[PDB]
Structures are given as C-alpha cells and as structure tokens.
Amino acid sequence: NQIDLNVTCRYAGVFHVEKNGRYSISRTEAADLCQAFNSTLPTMDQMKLALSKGFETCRYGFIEGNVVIPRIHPNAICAANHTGVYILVTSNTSHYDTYCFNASAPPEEDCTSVTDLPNSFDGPVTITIVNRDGTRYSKKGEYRTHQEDI
C-alpha cells in the first residue's frame, strides 16, 4: 500500500507534486495533499510570482480555481509553445498533478530537497516523497479525507 509523491524545488513557496508517475489527483485530493505539506493550492497571483522567480513545469496541475502549466521557455510539447501561466481551457477529464504553496518557504528559488510530510495523519499507506535528485523520505500515514479519492 504505497504512494510516491515526486516533488520539485519551491519558487516563492510554490512547488509541483506528481503522484505515482501519472496524472492521478482529483481537485479534492489536491487540497488534502497540499494540507499534508502545511500548504494550500496556490492562488493565480502566487503562481505568477513563482513563475517570475524561475518556476516552470511541463505538467498540468491544480491551483485555486484552474488547472495550469507555468512556462518560461517556449516548448512545442509544453502548453502548445506558450509562456506565462498557461491555463487549461478544454478537457474531458478530471485528474491532474497539483501545485502547492508553503508560505514559510524561502522567497525565491529553493532547490533544497523535501525531507518531511509534516501534516499527514494516522493511516496505513507508505507515502514516499521523491526528490528530483532521487533522495527520498518515507512515512506511514494518510492524507486523503474523501473516501472516493481512496
């Protein structure tokens, strides 16, 4: 019973989380997941400030109110070559990655690794945080509060 959470650098407190190497997070699960990192879904303003500090991904993820991809450099297979916070407009489907915002993180680029899941609760799942440099932190617990997300 295992969940892998791949996480990025934080930029003005904003970071990306991909679950189990595939788009697999619902909007309700995303809020609960960020809560386990003492974080919240970023506002569009928080995400724009993270972008300005160097944040970009090539994956759709929730923020408050929308699903987006932050882009700095144009790439034809990432958000159809757009730059800025690209907003998903049309999709049949509901599951994506998530972004999270930690207000206590550093103000600019923080590419140190993540070594804790501070606000998960008691549960049976082995949750493993996987950093980009491969370092891992694991703990037994749960973060999902909605039964339909389990």
Ligand SMILES: OC1CCN(Cc2ccsc2)CC1
């Ligand atoms: O009230 C709930 C809190 C979270 N737990 C999770 C769990 C499932 C098997 S063991 C622990 C269940 C009861």
